[PDB]
């Protein structure tokens, strides 16, 4: 009955992931697309399989406060967790052991992004208005830039030399780390056009486009190509929501650059078609503000995480 | 087609600061945020450095008081706090006495 074109191998087209005991603040799909890293407010990371049971086969603990942001490392076996307990942590996924815990920040480490081409290096931007760059094998932080306003969202560019940081200061900045080996570098690019804070930053699958979610209830698409018009602003999306919760609401690109998914505070999973700049999917089902949405590496699968201690995991039909 | 009987009841999940903060921005102050995300609701109805300093002064002053290690302490006040319109109610109580006493013609 109803036989509507099963896309994925998942048992069902809509799967809810439960087992957390707090808000789920950020999630991430394995590069090989058969793992889930879910970081909750309960300062814990659930590791789920994407197929055949959706088994949370490991719960990694070790943060003393909410694990606000999780990415995987480029090979998928090491995990980068960032928290409110001022401590970013590198873990081994298969094992259940923590590898390297760096806690150099003074306040909540809101945002992080690990570099996708090059060395094992990740940026982390926290409440101290400082965006710091962290190389894996040294135990000191390799870079430290100081804005004046608490850093909400940070990303490392496709190519690996600049860092994007956006926060409460109404303008997102692009900085050059090789241009800066000093302790008070000044910003390279000032993307303006959001009318208040930025909450989430995603680097496009080609690297020319940066996605910014703003509590300006606006998704904005900028181009980072060093040869741009005077206004790097390309696209605007309307539809999602930000409320008094001021949660860390993020961005994502479909693995093809064809869709863009935002987490919203109206409990809705929003998925726009980037081209027509209009709303493809408006999926309900979450009882709390939708914190981050992640598109599965291979298939059109979208998985969302909410402040309702669950994660919906399903495929898109049209 | 509605959920509850007189409207739609839907589960919610926030962090607990947010319920309380909004409930008390409106509750006490009169004016707060709409829980729907649509604007704000209703109509509106610290500390210092010289004053902070002067309190530190009075603290150090109570510290400057001489202590006599010979002398026991006594209790002087010893419980001062414990030993510690009317017109309409006067007229009403007059009416009460009236309806009380009243509580207690034929022709051809």
């Amino acid at each position: 009955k109803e036989g509507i074109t099963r896309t994925s191998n998942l048992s069902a087209p809509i799967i809810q992931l439960s087992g957390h005991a707090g808000e789920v603040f950020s999630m991430r799909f394995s590069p090989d697309g058969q793992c889930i890293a879910s970081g909750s407010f309960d300062k814990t990371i659930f590791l789920w399989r994407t197929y055949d049971e959706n088994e949370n086969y490991n719960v990694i603990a070790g943060h003393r406060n909410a694990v606000l942001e999780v990415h995987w490392f480029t090979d998928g076996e090491a995990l980068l967790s960032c928290s409110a307990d001022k401590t970013a942590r590198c873990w081994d996924a298969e094992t259940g052991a923590p590898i390297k815990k760096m806690g150099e920040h003074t306040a909540v480490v809101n945002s992080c992004c690990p570099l996708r081409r090059g060395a094992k290096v990740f940026v982390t931007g926290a409440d101290d208005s400082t965006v710091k760059v962290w190389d894996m094998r040294v135990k000191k932080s390799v870079h430290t830039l100081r804005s004046e306003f608490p850093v909400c969202a940070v990303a490392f560019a496709d190519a690996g030399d600049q860092v994007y940081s956006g926060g409460v200061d109404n303008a997102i900045k692009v900085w050059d780390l090789r241009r800066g080996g000093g302790a008070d570098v000044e910003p390279s690019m000032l993307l303006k056009g959001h009318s208040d804070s930025v909450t989430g930053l995603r680097v496009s699958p080609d690297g020319g486009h940066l996605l910014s979610n703003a509590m300006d209830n606006t998704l904005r698409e900028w181009d980072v190509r060093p040869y741009a018009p005077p206004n790097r602003c390309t696209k605007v999306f309307t539809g999602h929501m930000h409320n008094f919760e001021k949660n860390l609401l993020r961005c994502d690109y479909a693995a093809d650059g064809s869709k863009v998914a935002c987490g919203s505070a109206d409990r809705m999973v929003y998925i726009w078609d980037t081209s027509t700049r209009k709303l493809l999917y408006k999926l309900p089902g979450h009882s709390g503000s939708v914190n981050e949405v992640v598109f599965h590496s291979k298939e059109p699968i979208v998985a969302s995480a909410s402040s309702d201690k669950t994660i919906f995991l399903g495929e898109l039909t049209q | 087609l509605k959920n509850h009987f007189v409207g739609h009841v839907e589960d919610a999940h926030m962090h607990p600061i947010h319920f309380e903060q909004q409930y008390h921005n409106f509750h006490a102050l009169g004016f707060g945020e709409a829980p729907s995300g649509i604007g704000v609701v209703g109509k509106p109805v610290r500390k210092t450095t010289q004053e902070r300093k002067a309190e530190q002064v009075a603290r150090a002053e109570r510290l400057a008081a001489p202590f006599d290690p010979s002398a026991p302490f006594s209790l002087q006040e010893r419980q001062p706090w414990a030993s510690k319109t009317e017109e309409q109610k006067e007229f009403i109580a007059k009416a009460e006495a009236a309806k009380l006493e009243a509580a207690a013609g034929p022709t051809s």
Binding site: W48, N54, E55, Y57 | -
Partner: peptide
């Protein structure tokens, strides 16, 4: 080291 997670199939609820 299976953790305290489950995944169950559920439709997404709708408000109307």
């Amino acid at each position: 080291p299976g953790g305290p997670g489950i995944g169950r199939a559920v439709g997404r609820g709708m408000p109307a």
